[PDB]
UniProtKB/Swiss-Prot annotation, chains A, B:
Entry GO terms, CC: cytoplasm; cytosol
UniProt-listed Pfam families: Aminotran_1_2
Top enzyme class: transferase
Oligomer status and interactors: Homodimer.
EC identifiers of the protein: 2.6.1.1
Secretion signal, residue range per the UniProt entry: none
Matching PROSITE patterns: AA_TRANSFER_CLASS_1
Protein encoded by which gene: aspC
Protein name: Aspartate aminotransferase
UniProt modified residues of type N6-(pyridoxal phosphate)lysine: K246
UniProt induction comment: Transcription is increased specifically in response to 2,4,6-trinitrotoluene (TNT) and its indicator compounds 1,3-DNB, 2,4-DNT, and 2,6-DNT.
Binding annotation for L-aspartate: G34, W130, N183, F374
Family classification: Belongs to the class-I pyridoxal-phosphate-dependent aminotransferase family.
Reaction(s) the record says it catalyses: L-aspartate + 2-oxoglutarate = oxaloacetate + L-glutamate
Length: 396, 396
């Protein structure tokens, strides 16, 4: 059966980490890591999370199966983080949430479920979008198309090209958005923008699906949701996929969730059942541990408070490198403008650099950057900034 | 989009636990639980697991993403538990293992991967088989057919009907087996039986896929694998799906794994890549926590030793109820033979009882049993045995 021909031509992971895992001089990391790193290059484990990890060592009584949808507390908790405080979408019971081996879990689960119950044929992702997007959905047998976004050149969102690319879409078509700023270039629709996508989105069909990892990394836990929230001001039907993998620095635990909305609660229920349908058919129920950490930090408001400050730290270091990058680059000699990298959000941004600068940087240079010129601001530490910036400007 | 018609007609879970969750007199549990219970009706959390849970509170340095295949230690460790000690299938590097949100995760992942790379069209499950089997594979677009097994009446494996039902199968068809004794009736092929399935299996085509949750519950960690192992003595190509969900009482953590075999290591590799392919496309990498517990107990041989004794306990309580069931039933008045329930293995066995005894037991009786007459020996405690056995014999 497996004997003769298969093999991968694979993901931009070992597509950079393994040459890094060998191409040893004093390698300026990959800026092609997918995780955050602190001022020392470590991707710590959090005080809010540990303290919470301990609350579980002691309080757990059984490792008894979780409900298909998971931890309801996590539920309440996730819902309220995405839609708000007195959110009339919560009291009103239009939203239902599933706990999933998070982020990708949710987009998958979202995928498999749309694929029946629904007659969604295509998914519109965005050029570029997080690399693993296409695979999730092709896997489920939905065809993926791309809308414009960052035509680049002038480093911002070619708003017009988007709207323009989008009109090709249609009524029962799902349009994938990243709530708060986009992997790989933290370029944001401003509220207005977010606002018109929504006006357009209702008058044309489009079930909107939010891909939401990164909340609290652009401006703040609650502002980051505004995009999700205005859409949500006017949808009836909407679906969002979340991850506490980045915001809780819980990467390996696999935490995130899938929220589904319907006009009303009866409808929400006939459909959530069918999303649970798709869950018993994937993995029968989600992994507790991560989410309990999660459910526990969001409930304990002392632990929340301590948790909100770490994230603040995160997000802040990230902001500090973005200026420093542009600064160390001034001083050292660059023929260009990159004042565009302090304008973007998140870990990611494309360093406007060529497939070949990117490659002239891994020879007698040593910096790892995935071929697309995309760097992870998070891998830049205050001291590695010197050499990095020598190297970047020694190619332009 | 979701508006009008969907809804579930669902899993034998709330299909029994929810009426239990309400039908309150002194309800004799459901014997329609899917988890083990101790002599008090609790599904504890283990000393081996806690001690290990603590080793992690203190030793974890980052929550950094796991490899797609997961924890390699878990790897080594799982492989050696399934195939053995000096296993020439390990040194020989024909086996490769993926860590997955376990058990169902693995059958799914196994499913999605067969579905391309391979030209497996059908899956042969067994009548009955674990209820969630059909959904996993239909979900992936493989058609499921059933082979005979327990025609019942004479409570044992209609060996002949199996062989007989099987011949309809064919060359690139996957045949699903439960390594050590079967959910819902712990009826075993003896080594010989296991042995002929294998002889047959090579001479006819059939990629064999083992569904293996329950190891150490029939006779012992190592004997339970004999079935897996003799097949494995002669396959080249074979695939097994595991779960430490029952044996480690880790139910909610989601621990298990998918082992794939090929004739040789080159071939194993072109295909594992494509199984990792299917993994980045499901959830991008598995949840650490559970498996670290797992990887940690199997390496630390003090913790292993302590772990092997709990399981022994488990398996033993399970054996003690099976005799007690048959005994309390003698004494109290039954018109039948049920000496067949001390012959079976595992938590499960069908109490030869009718859809209507099953139902005459939930009226002014109070015992919950999924309509198929299947009981979970594990929910029977030494004291609830009195009333249960009054009730069972008061209907025959
Ligand atoms: C980081 C990220 C994810 C993460 O999915 P998880 O399994 O939560 O790691 C998903 N989508 C996007 C756009 C991301 O940036
Ligand atoms: C219990 C059981 C499973 C469990 O899958 P998990 O997700 O590990 O709970 C799978 N298959 C069979 C036959 C089982 O009995």
């Amino acid at each position: 059966m497996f004997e003769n021909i298969t093999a991968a031509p694979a993901d931009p992971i070992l597509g950079l980490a393994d040459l890094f895992r060998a191409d040893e001089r004093p390698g300026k990391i990959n800026l092609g890591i997918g995780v955050y790193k602190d001022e020392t290059g470590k991707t710590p484990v959090l005080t809010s999370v540990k303290k919470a990890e301990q609350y579980l060592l002691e309080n757990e009584t059984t490792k008894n199966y979780l409900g298909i949808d998971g931890i309801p507390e996590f539920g309440r908790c996730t819902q309220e983080l995405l839609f708000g405080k007195g959110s009339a979408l919560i009291n009103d019971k239009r939203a239902r949430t599933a706990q999933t081996p998070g982020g990708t879990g949710a987009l998958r689960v979202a995928a498999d479920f749309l694929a029946k119950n629904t007659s969604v044929k295509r998914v519109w992702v965005s050029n570029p979008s997080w690399p693993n997007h296409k695979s999730v959905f092709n896997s489920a047998g939905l065809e993926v198309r791309e809308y414009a976004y960052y035509d680049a050149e002038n480093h911002t969102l070619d708003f017009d090209a988007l709207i323009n690319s989008l009109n090709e879409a249609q009524a029962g078509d799902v349009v994938l958005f990243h709530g708060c700023c986009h992997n790989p270039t933290g370029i944001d629709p401003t509220l207005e923008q977010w606002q018109t996508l929504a006006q357009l989105s209702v008058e044309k069909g489009w079930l909107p699906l939010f891909d939401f990892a990164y909340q609290g990394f652009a401006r703040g836990l609650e502002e980051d949701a505004e995009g999700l929230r205005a859409f949500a001001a006017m949808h009836k039907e909407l679906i969002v996929a979340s991850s506490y993998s980045k915001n809780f620095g819980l990467y390996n635990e696999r935490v995130g969730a899938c929220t589904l909305v319907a006009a009303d609660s009866e409808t929400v229920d006939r459909a959530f059942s069918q999303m649970k349908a798709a869950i018993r058919a994937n993995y029968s129920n989600p992994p507790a541990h991560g989410a309990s950490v999660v459910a526990t930090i969001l409930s304990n408001d002392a632990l929340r408070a301590i948790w909100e400050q770490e994230l603040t730290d995160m997000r802040q270091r990230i902001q500090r490198m973005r200026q420093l990058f542009v600064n160390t680059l001034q001083e050292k000699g660059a023929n260009r403008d990159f004042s565009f990298i302090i304008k973007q959000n998140g870990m990611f941004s494309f360093s406007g650099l060529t497939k070949e600068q990117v490659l002239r940087l891994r020879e007698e240079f040593g910096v790892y950057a995935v071929a697309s010129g995309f760097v992870n601001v998070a891998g830049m530490t205050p001291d590695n900034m010197a050499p990095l910036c020598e190297a970047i400007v020694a190619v332009l």
